[PDB]
Each structure stands twice: as C-alpha cells, then as structure tokens.
Amino acid sequence: RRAGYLHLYGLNLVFDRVGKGPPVLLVAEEASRWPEALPEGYAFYLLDLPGYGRTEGPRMAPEELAHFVAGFAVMMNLGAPWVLLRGLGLALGPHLEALGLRALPAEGVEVAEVLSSKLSYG
Amino acid sequence: RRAGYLHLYGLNLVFDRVGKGPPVLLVAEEASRWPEALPEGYAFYLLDLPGYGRTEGPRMAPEELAHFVAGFAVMMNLGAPWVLLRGLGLALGPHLEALGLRALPAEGVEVAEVLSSKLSYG
C-alpha cells in the first residue's frame, strides 16, 4: 500500500493508493475505516478527509467535503470513479450525486461484496 | 492576452488569459466573443469550449460543458471563480450554479460593467 497527497483548495489531502485497474474512491473520515482486504482488479484511493486522519484542515459541512472529493477525481484524472461511502462519508452521498459521481454506501459491508453486487453477473 | 492550453477530460482546452487579481472565467463558444477591453484587477480566463474555436472536441450538452468549466476551475486552482456567460455559454448557467460556481449573464453588457455592477449594486 502507499500514502501520498494532493494539494487542493489550499489543503494537502492525504490518501492511500493500492491495486491496479478501474479507479474507485473509498470515502470515510479517513483511510483507517477500510480495514478489510480489498479485491484485485481495481485502483483504490482511500482519502483522509480534511479535518480527519492525516489531512490537516478545518471541520467542514458535508457539501463542502463533497467538493473536495469531486475535486480529487478530476485533478487526479480518474474521470468519474465510483465512490464507496462509510462513516462521515455517508453524508456526502447526495452531494456527490449532484456533482456527477455515483455514490455507493458501503457501511457494514466489505468492498469486495459491494463491487460484486453492483456489477457481478447482473 | 496570452494563449494557453489545459489537457482536461481527454481534451486540450485552449484559453486566453489576461490580468492579475481574483480569477474570473469568461465563458462563451470561444475567446473572441469577448472583444471589449477588460478591467484591471482580475485574472481573466477566456475559454474556447470543446468543439469551438481552438479546442478540438465533440459537440456536447450544456450540462456536460458545465462540467468542463468546473473541471477547468479546480484544475487551474482557481477556487470558486465567477463565470460570466455569453452566447452558447448562457445555456450552462443553471448547471454551473449546481456545481457550485456563480454564473453571471453578460449577454448585453461589457464585462467591466457586469463586475462593477454586480459587486457594487445590491
């Protein structure tokens, strides 16, 4: 696994990367909320949202946070990756949708099962 | 006015730039639709939308084009710049606002009057 950061909106948003394949954003308060073994075949980006984990920043409302996530997708040239949500991430869902990013709640369910359900044979 | 380019969403969006200060996006089909003399104090970015002028691209819907504009702003680290509209650009207004950018119609007015009026009156 690997850590890195993107300078965006005057902040340095820290995140973890791992895997190769179509890109998928994993969004919770921070990378630590995704402990499960992730599946092969996808380029995962685990964001630490501003104000949590390793990303220094102020505490912002859900809609402001959603712009940081939409901002991340375009600045990293990920196009329109799917966004899995957990914890504080859940509250971003509606806002992400309005920004053109499909949001998939993954609270209490492993990433491997989510990507399979919403993709695998059906 | 210095010409430039930004690779975005697979395309090379050409734009003209002039001025220093708060950033301001002038969006119409392309740059030459802003003949007026622009006021000092703003960093103006005049876009040639995909498919028009110097920007090679397919004909896209207004909601799709609003995405390019938003993409341009975060990509160029412009924060939340106001977007003045003219011609084709006017159709983008609603979608732009929904993406978090304030759109101002500049159909009949020269940019300087639009900005001084919006900033000073009301």
Identify the residue among A7, A74, A92, A95 best suited for mutation to test binding to B, counting B beta carbons within 10 A and taking the highest. A74
Domain CATH for B91: 3.40.50.12270
Degrees (nearest 5) of the Cα angle A109, A62, A46? 45
In order, the DSSP letters of A42-84 are -EEEEE--TTSTT-------HHHHHHHHHHHHHHTT--S-EEE
Locate B43 and state its tokens: 């960093």
- Apex B38 CA angle, B36 and B43, nearest 5: 140
What is the nearest CA distance from B43 to chain A, expressed in angstroms? 18
Nearest by CB to residue B75, choosing from A67, A74, A99, is A74
- Two structure tokens written together for A70: 């939409």
Mutate to test the interface with A, among B74, B96, B97 (most CBs of A within 10 A): B74
Distances from the Cα of A42 to the Cα of A70, A96, A112, angstroms:
19, 20, 10
Question: From CA A84, how far away is CA B15, in angstroms rounded?
Answer: 35
Dihedral angle sign, alpha carbons of residues B99, B100, B106, B112? negative
How many folded domains does chain B comprise? 1
* Domain range for B30: 1-122
Task: Give the amino acid at A61.
Answer: A
Contact B100 A75 (CB under 8 A): no
To the nearest whole Å, the CA of A39 is away from the closest chain B CA by 27
Count chain A–chain B contacts defined by CB atoms under 8 A. Answer: 18
Instruction: Give, for A115, the enclosing helix (H) or strand (E).
Output: helix A111-117
Q: Side by side, which strands form the sheet with A2-8? A: A2-8, A11-18, A43-47, A23-27, A82-85, A103-105
